[PDB]
């Protein structure tokens with residue numbers, strides 16, 4: 001199957017652009033990464049840093065996860081991210097998103113051996 005680490009890469013990694021490509025970015029990316037096939041995923045974040053930089057977060061600041069588990073980590077540096085949020089116009093499967101660029105610390109949940117990101121928890 002798709003591993004949880006690979007699913008994190010598909011849902012959350014976009015190292016090829018420095019920032020949010022355009023006002024079209026989320027519309028295109030939510031579709032191309034398969035986040036609109038079963039339903040419009042309501043919110044989702046993409047990180048514009050190298051895979052190694054995001055993986056390194058699993059050894060950075062340990063913080064509680066929103067679900068109460070203890071395996072979340074906050075990046076020491078700010079990272080370039082793009083938040084995608086479903087609009088009102090949006091009706092599946094013509095899912096429509098607002099694209100917002102930001103520079104924030106990311107919080108990811110990590111699991112496994114090797115210990116790698118498997119869930120995007122928050123940005124702060």
Ligand SMILES: Nc1ncnc2c1ncn2[C@@H]1O[C@H](COP(=O)(O)OP2(=O)OP(=O)(O)OP(=O)(O)OP(=O)(O)O2)[C@@H](O)[C@H]1O
Nearest residue numbers: 011043044065067069070071072109110111118119120121
């Ligand atoms: N401390 C944790 N460690 C490992 N996994 C966790 C943890 N805390 C929540 N999780 C997972 O977070 C899911 C949220 O279920 P949800 O309905 O939101 O679909 P998701 O696609 O959307 P999310 O944006 O939250 O998240 P993600 O896009 O990244 O993808 P994930 O596959 O993680 O979830 C839960 O089921 C768990 O597997």
